[PDB]
Amino acid sequence: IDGYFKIYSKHTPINLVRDLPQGFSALEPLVDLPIGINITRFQTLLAL
Amino acid sequence: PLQSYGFQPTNGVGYQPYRVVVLSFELLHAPATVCGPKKSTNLVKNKCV
Amino acid sequence: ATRFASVYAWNRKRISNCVADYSVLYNSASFSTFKCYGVSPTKLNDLCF
Amino acid sequence: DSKVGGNYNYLYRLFRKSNLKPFERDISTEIYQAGSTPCNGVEGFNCYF
Q: Could you give the C-alpha distances from B22 to C11, C31, C34, C40, D9, in angstroms and in order?
């Protein structure tokens, strides 16, 4: 947006086997990249 | 197509070597990746300023 | 830099993601020529690119 | 107002300390000091007519 790529995050402790947990938690801003590229797709990177 | 410069130190100043740097600045809607230092003042308190 | 480029193969370095201080250049007095076009040499330090 | 080889009868102010007020005139010929270094009344680095 507005000429940047912007990222927000938070990490939280859990104890569950499956599915996204209940409850509220607001993500804080992480980084604000001044990069002008077009984006329309993404893919996850994984460790074997 | 290329010719070498012959720079002897005794050559006349028009034939002596000059170094050049050209700084090209672009102004756009794009984000400002470079800016000047905007040198700060001291900070003072409890006064209308 | 110790060695400059040959002018037929003029080097370009991108300057970005940094804070400048063009006053250190302009007040150096080491330079025989310091010409700016469209931008004033003095106000250059008060500006972003 | 033009002639072969170029007419130089007409001059204009290329450097000034500040912008002119409405209908102001400035006929001063003092060498403009663009930098921190004093001009001592002669042209030089950052010192131009």
A: 10, 12, 10, 15, 33
